[PDB]
Amino acid sequence: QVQLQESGGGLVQAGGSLRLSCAASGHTFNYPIMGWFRQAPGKEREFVGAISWSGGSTSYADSVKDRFTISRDNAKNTVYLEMNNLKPEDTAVYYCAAKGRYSGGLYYPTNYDYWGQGTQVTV
Amino acid sequence: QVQLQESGGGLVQAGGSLRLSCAASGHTFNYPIMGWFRQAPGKEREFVGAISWSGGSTSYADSVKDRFTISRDNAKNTVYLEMNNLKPEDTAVYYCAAKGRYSGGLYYPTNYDYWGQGTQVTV
Amino acid sequence: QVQLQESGGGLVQAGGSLRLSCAASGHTFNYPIMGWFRQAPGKEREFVGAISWSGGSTSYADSVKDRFTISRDNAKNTVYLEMNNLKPEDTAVYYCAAKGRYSGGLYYPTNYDYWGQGTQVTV
Amino acid sequence: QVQLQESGGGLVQAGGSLRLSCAASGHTFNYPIMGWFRQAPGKEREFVGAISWSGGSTSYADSVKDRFTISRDNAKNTVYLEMNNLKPEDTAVYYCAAKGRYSGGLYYPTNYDYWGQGTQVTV
Amino acid sequence: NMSFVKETVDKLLKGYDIRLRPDFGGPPVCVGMNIDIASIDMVSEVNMDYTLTMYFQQYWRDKRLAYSGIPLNLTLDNRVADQLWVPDTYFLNDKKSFVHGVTVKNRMIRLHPDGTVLYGLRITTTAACMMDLRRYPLDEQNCTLEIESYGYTTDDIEFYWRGGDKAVTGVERIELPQFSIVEHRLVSRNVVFATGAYPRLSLSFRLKRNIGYFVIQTYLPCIMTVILSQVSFWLNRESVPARTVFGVTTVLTMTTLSISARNSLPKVAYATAMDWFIAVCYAFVFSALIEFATVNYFTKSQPARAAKIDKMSRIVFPILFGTFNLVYWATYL
Amino acid sequence: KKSFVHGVTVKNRMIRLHPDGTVLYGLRITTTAACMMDLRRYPLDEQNCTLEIESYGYTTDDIEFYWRGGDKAVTGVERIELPQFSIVEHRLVSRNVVFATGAYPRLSLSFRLKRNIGYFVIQTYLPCIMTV
Amino acid sequence: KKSFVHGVTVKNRMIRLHPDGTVLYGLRITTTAACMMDLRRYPLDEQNCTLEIESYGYTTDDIEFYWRGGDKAVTGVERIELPQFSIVEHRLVSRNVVFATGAYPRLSLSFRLKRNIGYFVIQTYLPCIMTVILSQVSFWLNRESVPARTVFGVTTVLTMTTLSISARNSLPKVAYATAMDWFIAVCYAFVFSALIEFATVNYFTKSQPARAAKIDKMSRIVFPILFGTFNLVYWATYL
Ligand SMILES: *[C@@H]1O[C@H](CO)[C@@H](O[C@@H]2O[C@H](CO)[C@@H](O[C@@H]3O[C@H](CO[C@H]4O[C@H](CO)[C@@H](O)[C@H](O[C@H]5O[C@H](CO)[C@@H](O)[C@H](O)[C@@H]5O)[C@@H]4O)[C@@H](O)[C@H](O[C@H]4O[C@H](CO)[C@@H](O)[C@H](O)[C@@H]4O)[C@@H]3O)[C@H](O)[C@H]2NC(C)=O)[C@H](O)[C@H]1NC(C)=O
Ligand SMILES: *[C@@H]1O[C@H](CO)[C@@H](O[C@@H]2O[C@H](CO)[C@@H](O[C@@H]3O[C@H](CO[C@H]4O[C@H](CO)[C@@H](O)[C@H](O)[C@@H]4O)[C@@H](O)[C@H](O[C@H]4O[C@H](CO)[C@@H](O)[C@H](O)[C@@H]4O)[C@@H]3O)[C@H](O)[C@H]2NC(C)=O)[C@H](O)[C@H]1NC(C)=O
Ligand SMILES: *[C@@H]1O[C@H](CO)[C@@H](O[C@@H]2O[C@H](CO)[C@@H](O[C@@H]3O[C@H](CO[C@H]4O[C@H](CO)[C@@H](O)[C@H](O)[C@@H]4O)[C@@H](O)[C@H](O[C@H]4O[C@H](CO)[C@@H](O)[C@H](O)[C@@H]4O)[C@@H]3O)[C@H](O)[C@H]2NC(C)=O)[C@H](O)[C@H]1NC(C)=O
Ligand SMILES: *[C@@H]1O[C@H](CO)[C@@H](O[C@@H]2O[C@H](CO)[C@@H](O[C@@H]3O[C@H](CO[C@H]4O[C@H](CO)[C@@H](O)[C@H](O)[C@@H]4O)[C@@H](O)[C@H](O[C@H]4O[C@H](CO)[C@@H](O)[C@H](O)[C@@H]4O)[C@@H]3O)[C@H](O)[C@H]2NC(C)=O)[C@H](O)[C@H]1NC(C)=O
Ligand SMILES: *[C@@H]1O[C@H](CO)[C@@H](O)[C@H](O)[C@H]1NC(C)=O
């Protein structure tokens, strides 16, 4: 099993920056890919981006592309999400998820086995 | 050939525990899997459980599941059967059997080549 | 080529024993299997038994089974035929033959390339 | 990427000789084959010749065959084109091109990814 | 009865379109999986795969294949499968699999008057099993067999383990020299791709590695080569060449152990539990050399001190190595 | 150099038709493809391995290729798990290449593999530096 | 694990019909089949390799198997020519085995392979025995050539480890010790002890030179006798 916990969420002013963290414990090897999802009050759960076990390869949503960056540090069992030039459209509860090695496509939340109770970001 | 002999059978009071042993001699390598069967006075010979050559993998009947445990000690050429929380339904002559490497399914006694003349358990 | 010579044939009384030898010279490697045939006065040439190059595996006729034993000693390039509990039905000229590596079935004399002029056994 | 630059172009009298050079910089490994093309005022861009990464194998047009020679010197990241017994038909802007590893036939200019702004030869 | 039956079969296959699943436009087909493991033949740390042999049985219901008249289940020649519809089940994580061919294609078809089909295959797969060799060779691994349909979505196909927990057999039959199966697990999931949502079943093993081979081939050579280095402490300082022989040979036989031990693995970029052990063993032999080099540096200047260095080393070195072992082994068992 | 399409339990290929007339033809393929390597800065190197996709017989007069979804046509680079390398980026390309028999469509998938040095310090740098 | 039917020049299969209706269907097949091996007494072992023959789909309700000609149903065991083994006997069996999908017919062909030790003496036992004899030569050399006698010590100990490792490399990664592994382990004792012996001799070599020389003079006779009698017990035990 795996246990994920987030932090770094808070109030930020538009055009601002913020860094979210996700610390993991347990069988992180069996769930190599880490993903970020956000859930606005009204809208459905949206894919933000994801990162690989080696940390080399990433993938972002178009809306979030070029304004956010996801990084990994397997030394600290933690993935980071730097959000720069923030818009009010970005306001949501940001979730951290871990996906199994053979669990299909990145974009679809179904496939992620383990989540962390999210942190709020308001802009 | 192989020769099997049991011990540890006796009178026990309900909810009690008992440990049966089966000591083996001869070509134990050619007959890696060991099985436990029990035969009530009226009823047919029933599969209890079984254990592998490596000793790692086991398999139990549903009735006996969670109340019995089978273990191996290839050092002493012996398999053990610990029966805990015994019921009067468990009363029977408990047999010890050895199965050939490619002898088909565990549950069916036909497939076991060598048996030991069983020990009585009454509850 | 190969050259085979027998010995040990003689007069024996019923229930008696006798040991036939067959000493070989030349390319014994190219003709690994050795065979024993006997030819009664009236009957056809009959297969007695045969032995392998390694000497481990043998094969005997049913009539001769359990009363004869064939052995090899590649040290002396010799195969032996011990005939115990001899019957009058065993009376014949006993032949020694060598078969090529891929020469088909043991029982059929055609397949053997080299023979030795046989020795008489009378019972 | 790759950057190519030529030199050595000038005025020459018929039957004369001239040596063109092409100095390359950047990812020259990804574009192993080098090619020479010439463009007359009216006519279309014509294949002159080409040379391999190892420098061993070359290939020339029929018109230019026997009168020109192409050489490589990977030490200086440079290919040379020696033009001897020059004719007035040879008058053109001589180009230097680099082709990708799996880019199809030598003769066709489309396939070359990188060119250098050519040098003039008049005869 | 033989003529009667050929007709009933011929009518089953008259107008049968293999292109259409059962209930083509209708509900999805419940396909029941049933595996009987024959053997795991090989486990490669180098290629991070394992090779598996199984009987793979599938049950589904094609109403087109119902027969009322006949009073038995019909076992037909395997070649009928070519003229039946069968589910497009594959193994997601296989590198190379094949279906045994001798003496005939190892596949079974049994029909039931129900219309229920039983389609057995004997398959050997070599499937990917990514390995966490960090605690090697005191490790265990989780190797899986991901079973999915290639083309048909959840709208058309469903998978289920036939018999639930009891759907898989033969884990007891697995006989690996190097591992032992601690448990196995069955799972049922729906996975989502771009082309839609597909059914998956995931069979998993947990392989605990036996260390017998590795003590013989690595730990003993290392531990003995460390003990050898510390014998040089009991030789008089004045045989400088003798004690350099002990120094140099033990240091080189330590590097050669660390390299040859690394050669049986994949070129992972982390250090295994064995790699630390060997690294520490290298410290104990390189230290033993530097110790002597120091002893030799005082051996005429201050001979009293040099001889005391030895007398200390003769006791400090083995105690440290002894207590190191007790910490290392406790930590990794 | 050698490719094959997986066969178990059935030929791993999919056909989905649409009332449109549009066909979806999926294959599961393992290829071993050539990747010429510049080992000059080995083992502190990186390499560019490609998969050149082309039609064998049909020219541009008969066939066109395009990456369906542009930049987003390729998925799974994140799933690559190599002990010895890591994928720094990948690139999609669309080109027309010209042979003697005519001009054909090509798509080029490329990876950039950065080599991890962990193995080489353990095996070759430490032995060398320690032997010095 | 993998079997195939020969193809050249035509698929190697025969069909002969009889007016009876009886069919004769011959195939030439090469199989590589699993033979789990008990390498505990290796290389003084023997193994029991089998060929289990069964029908894939058809139960006992539809198919029966029998060895045609009983004992005499299998031929060619005499033709087997293995460099490393020899076939001591073979056995035919007929059984009915029960699976979940029903009861099937099986025939089981078995061989017993006795391993020839010739290869292993040449490539192991001699190197081990000679490397033990080499270690004990150092007892006949003046104790005062400390470097000489450490050369004998160290080289014999290392050539012993490399024998035990290289001998282990031709086998599967089994977790038990083979009869050869003991022999080699004991040989390692005899060479490591021969070193420690000298190390002791060197420790007394000025303190009590009389004692040091007596240790050697004892060792010169104790060591070979113990190694000699060890061999006689080991070989008797495993033959
Ligand atoms: C490599 O090793 C293989 C063996 O492992 C060698 O092969 C052997 O080569 C020799 C020749 O060097 C062969 O001997 C010849 O055999 C033929 C067989 O003819 C067959 O058909 C005939 C026609 O119907 C029939 O008459 C024969 O039957 C008689 O002979 C056989 C013995 O061969 C005997 O068993 C019968 O009872 C019959 O009496 C037989 O079925 C044969 O025709 C040859 O005879 C010629 O040579 C002899 C002298 O040897 C001469 O006197 C004759 O006049 C005649 O010219 C000859 O005997 C042998 O068959 C090969 N065996 C196999 C298994 O292949 C091979 O030669 C080696 N290589 C090299 C480079 O040497
Ligand atoms: C080898 O390693 C793999 C992982 O890499 C392990 O596989 C995981 O195994 C666990 C079980 O140990 C699986 O968890 C199970 O998942 C099932 C599917 O859940 C998803 O889908 C359902 C809808 O169908 C959703 O409701 C749910 O939220 C998930 O999105 C569940 O049905 C199981 O639930 C059961 O157990 C849980 C507690 O474990 C209970 O809370 C439930 O009530 C219920 O009883 C369960 O959660 C997991 O999906 C597997 N992942 C993959 C990718 O395989 C292997 O177990 C491991 N092998 C060994 C031997 O260790
Ligand atoms: C290699 O290793 C394998 C095991 O891994 C050995 O296999 C066993 O070999 C023995 C023979 O040595 C087999 O025993 C025989 O089984 C036959 C089948 O029995 C079935 O059918 C009979 C009725 O016909 C039932 O009674 C029985 O319960 C089974 O349903 C028996 O018919 C044989 O009986 C014959 O021999 C006995 C004495 O052994 C006589 O008393 C009888 O009268 C009769 O003549 C016999 O019992 C056993 O089945 C094999 N098991 C497997 C799993 O294959 C190989 O022998 C071994 N080979 C070598 C060379 O090492
Ligand atoms: C591994 O190595 C290979 C080479 O060995 C690299 O592949 C090359 O990648 C570059 C891009 O980085 C390619 O260059 C691009 O070619 C496109 C196609 O050009 C042809 O066709 C168009 C019409 O379809 C014509 O206009 C053109 O003249 C050519 O005939 C161009 O569309 C690209 O231009 C675009 O991008 C550039 C910036 O890169 C802009 O300046 C332009 O305005 C435009 O937007 C570009 O020129 C090249 O063709 C590839 N070569 C081959 C043989 O595939 C891999 O990139 C490399 N990968 C890694 C990861 O190392
Ligand atoms: C046919 O199969 C069914 C299982 O679906 C079984 O109950 C039935 O007994 C079988 N028929 C025969 C003749 O055994």
Three-state SS sequence of C22-72: EEEEECCCCCCEEEEEEECCCCCEEEEEEECCCCCCEEECCCCCCCEEEEE
**Residue E188 β-bridge partners:** E201
Question: Is E149 one of the annotated binding-site residues?
Answer: yes
Assess whether the C-beta atom of C101 lies below 6 angstroms from ligand 1. yes
Can you tell me whether residue E35 is helix, strand or coil? strand
H helix count then E strand count, chain C:
0, 9
Helix (H) or strand (E) holding E5: helix E2-13
Is the distance from CB of E199 to CB of E283 less than 8 angstroms? no
Is the distance from CB of D48 to CB of D38 less than 8 angstroms? yes
Q: How far is CA A80 from CA A34, A57, A95, E241, in A?
A: 10, 14, 12, 58
CA angle C16, C18, C20 (to 5 degrees): 160
**DSSP conformation class of B116:** E
Pocket residue to mutate for ligand 4, from D29, D99, D101, D113, most atoms within 8 A of Cβ: D113
Is the distance from CB of A14 to CB of A88 less than 8 angstroms? yes
Q: Give Cβ neighbours of residue E87 (< 8 Å, ≥ 6 apart).
A: E29, E31, E58, E60, E149, E152, E157
Q: Into which CATH architecture does domain E211-333 fall?
A: Up-down Bundle (1.20)
Helix (H) or strand (E) holding E201: strand E196-209
Per-residue tokens: G83: 């460099």
Can you tell me whether residue E284 is helix, strand or coil? helix
Amino acid at E232: S
Resolution of the determined structure in angstroms stands at 3.3
**Which residue of G36, G60, G91, G108 to mutate against B (max B Cβ within 10 Å)?**
G36
Is the distance from CB of E111 to CB of E76 less than 8 angstroms? yes
Q: How far is CA C46 from CA A41, C49, C105, in A?
A: 99, 9, 14
**Which residue of G74, G77, G79, G84 to mutate against C (max C Cβ within 10 Å)?**
G79
Ligand 2 center–CA E187 separation, angstroms: 6
Per-residue tokens: F84: 């010895």
Per-residue tokens: A36: 């970020």
Q: Which CATH number fits domain G117-239: 1.20.58.390, 2.40.110.10, 3.40.190.10, 1.10.10.10?
A: 1.20.58.390
Interface of G with B (CB under 8 A): 36, 38, 48, 50, 52, 96-100, 103-104, 108
Ligand 5 center–CA B64 separation, angstroms: 28
* Pick from A4, A44, A9: nearest CA to A119: A9
Computed on alpha carbons and rounded to an integer, the radius of gyration of chain F in Å comes to: 20
Return d(Cα E288, Cα E251) in angstroms, integer: 9
Is the distance from CB of E83 to CB of E18 less than 8 angstroms? yes
Is the distance from CB of B80 to CB of G75 less than 8 angstroms? no
| Proximal ligand: closest to the CA of G109 | 3
Work out the angle between the directed axes of helices E303-331 and E273-298 (0-180°, nearest 10): 170
Work out the angle between the directed axes of helices G146-168 and E220-229 (0-180°, nearest 10): 170
Per DSSP bridges, beta strands A78-83 and A92-99 are unpaired
C vs F contact (3+ beta-carbon pairs below 8 A): no
Ligand 1 center–CA C27 separation, angstroms: 14
Pocket residue to mutate for ligand 3, from B2, B30, B115, most atoms within 8 A of Cβ: B30
Per-residue tokens: G3: 């079997």
Question: Is G99 one of the annotated binding-site residues?
Answer: yes
Assess whether the C-beta atom of C71 lies below 6 angstroms from ligand 1. no
Burial of G118 (0-12, 13-18, 19+ CB in 10 A): exposed
**Which residue of A30, A52, A111 to mutate against F (max F Cβ within 10 Å)?**
A52
**DSSP conformation class of C122:** B
Can you tell me whether residue E304 is helix, strand or coil? helix
Amino acid at C49: G
Give the method of determination: X-ray
**Residue F87 β-bridge partners:** F113
Q: What is the 3-state secondary structure of G168-187?
A: HCCCCCCCCCCHHHHHHHHH
Is the distance from CB of D47 to CB of D59 less than 8 angstroms? no
φ and ψ at C86, to 5 degrees?
Answer: -70, 140
| Proximal ligand: closest to the CA of E116 | 5
φ and ψ at E139, to 5 degrees?
Answer: -105, 175
> CA of F129: which chain E residue's CA is closest?
E255
Return d(Cα G191, Cα E125) in angstroms, integer: 47
CA nearest ligand 4 atom 38, residue: D1
Residues of G in contact with E39 (CB under 8 A): 34
**Residue A58 β-bridge partners:** A51
Ligand 3 center–CA B103 separation, angstroms: 12
Of C32, C55, C57, the CB nearest to G77: C57
Instruction: Please answer yes or no on whether B110 and G38 come within 8 Å at the CB atom.
Output: no
Q: Give Cβ neighbours of residue F21 (< 8 Å, ≥ 6 apart).
A: none
* Pick from E273, E274, E138, E278: nearest CA to E222: E278
Return d(Cα C63, Cα C86) in angstroms, integer: 11
Residues of F in contact with D110 (CB under 8 A): 96-98, 103
Instruction: Please answer yes or no on whether E176 and B54 come within 8 Å at the CB atom.
Output: yes
Q: Alpha helix (H) ranges present in E144-301?
A: 212-214, 220-229, 240-262, 273-298
- Please, what sign has the CA dihedral across residues E105, E110, E111, E117? negative
Return d(Cα B117, Cα B94) in angstroms, integer: 9
Instruction: Please answer yes or no on whether E174 and B52 come within 8 Å at the CB atom.
Output: yes
Is the distance from CB of F52 to CB of A7 less than 8 angstroms? no
Q: Give Cβ neighbours of residue G218 (< 8 Å, ≥ 6 apart).
A: none
| CB atoms inside a 10 Å sphere around CB A13 | 8
- Please, what sign has the CA dihedral across residues E152, E153, E156, E162? positive
Q: How far is CA G99 from CA A47, B108, C107, G35, G60, in A?
A: 49, 8, 40, 22, 12
Can you tell me whether residue F50 is helix, strand or coil? strand
* Pick from A81, A70, A36, A28: nearest CA to A53: A28
Computed on alpha carbons and rounded to an integer, the radius of gyration of chain C in Å comes to: 13
Per-residue tokens: E145: 């067999």
Return d(Cα G71, Cα G69) in angstroms, integer: 6
Q: DSSP string of E125-180?
A: EEEE----GGGTTS-EEEEEEEEEESS--TTTEEEEETTGGGGEE-TTT---SSEE
In angstroms, what separates the C-alpha of D110 from chain F's closest C-alpha?
A: 7
Of G34, G173, G195, the CB nearest to E178: G173
Return d(Cα C57, Cα C54) in angstroms, integer: 8
Q: DSSP string of D42-79?
A: SSPEEEEEEE-SSS--EEE-TTTTTTEEEEEETTTTEE
Instruction: Please answer yes or no on whether E253 and G161 come within 8 Å at the CB atom.
Output: yes
Whose structure tokens read 């282990």?
G168
φ and ψ at F56, to 5 degrees?
Answer: -80, -45
Q: What superfamily does domain E1-210 belong to in CATH?
A: Neurotransmitter-gated ion-channel ligand-binding domain (2.70.170.10)
Q: What is the 3-state secondary structure of chain G?
A: CEEEECCCCCCCEEEEECCCCCEEEEECEEEECCCCCCHHHCCCCEEEEEEEEECCCCCCCCCCCCCCCHHHHCCCCCCCCCCCEEEEEEEEEEEEEEECCEEEEEEEEEEEEEECCHHHHHHHHHHHHHHHHHHHHHHHCCCCCHHHHHHHHHHHHHHHHHHHHHHHCCCCCCCCCCHHHHHHHHHHHHHHHHHHHHHHHHHHCCCCHHHHHHHHHHHHHHHHHHHHHHHHHHHHHCC
Helix (H) or strand (E) holding E200: strand E196-209
Exposed e or buried b for every residue in B9-18, given b needs 16+ CB within 10 A? beebeeeeeb
Q: Give Cβ neighbours of residue F126 (< 8 Å, ≥ 6 apart).
A: none
Can you tell me whether residue A65 is helix, strand or coil? coil
In angstroms, what separates the C-alpha of A104 from chain E's closest C-alpha?
A: 6
In angstroms, what separates the C-alpha of B32 from chain E's closest C-alpha?
A: 9
Residues of chain E with CATH 1.20.58.390: 211-333
Q: What is the 3-state secondary structure of B29-53?
A: CCCCEEEEEEECCCCCEEEEEEECC
B vs D contact (3+ beta-carbon pairs below 8 A): no
Which residue ranges of F are tagged as binding site for 4-aminobutanoate? 54, 56, 101
Can you tell me whether residue E330 is helix, strand or coil? helix
Is the distance from CB of B89 to CB of B97 less than 8 angstroms? no
Return d(Cα G209, Cα G47) in angstroms, integer: 56
In angstroms, what separates the C-alpha of F101 from chain D's closest C-alpha?
A: 10
Ligand 4 center–CA A31 separation, angstroms: 36
> CA of D31: which chain F residue's CA is closest?
F36
Return d(Cα E312, Cα E322) in angstroms, integer: 16
Return d(Cα G183, Cα G43) in angstroms, integer: 11
Where on the phi/psi map is residue C102: left (φ > 0), alpha (ψ -120 to 50), or beta? Answer: beta
**Which residue of E131, E146, E192, E198 to mutate against A (max A Cβ within 10 Å)?**
E192
Which residue ranges of F are tagged as binding site for benzamidine? 54-56, 99
Per-residue tokens: E31: 């396909």
Q: DSSP string of E64-79?
A: GG--SS--S-EEE-GG
Q: HSE-up of D103 (CA within 13 Å, CB side)?
A: 21
**Residue D81 β-bridge partners:** D20, D70
Is the distance from CB of C16 to CB of C35 less than 8 angstroms? no
Per-residue tokens: D108: 């066709």
* Pick from D75, D74, D106, D92: nearest CA to D38: D92
- CA E183 to chain CA centroid, nearest Å: 13
Q: Which atom of ligand 5 is the closest one to the Cα of E71?
A: 13
Assess whether the C-beta atom of B32 lies below 6 angstroms from ligand 3. no
Across chain A, where does the E strand assignment appear? 2-7, 18-26, 33-39, 46-51, 58-60, 68-73, 78-83, 92-99, 112-121
Work out the angle between the directed axes of helices E273-298 and E240-262 (0-180°, nearest 10): 170
E vs G contact (3+ beta-carbon pairs below 8 A): yes
**Residue F107 β-bridge partners:** F53, F94
Whose structure tokens read 């720094």?
F88
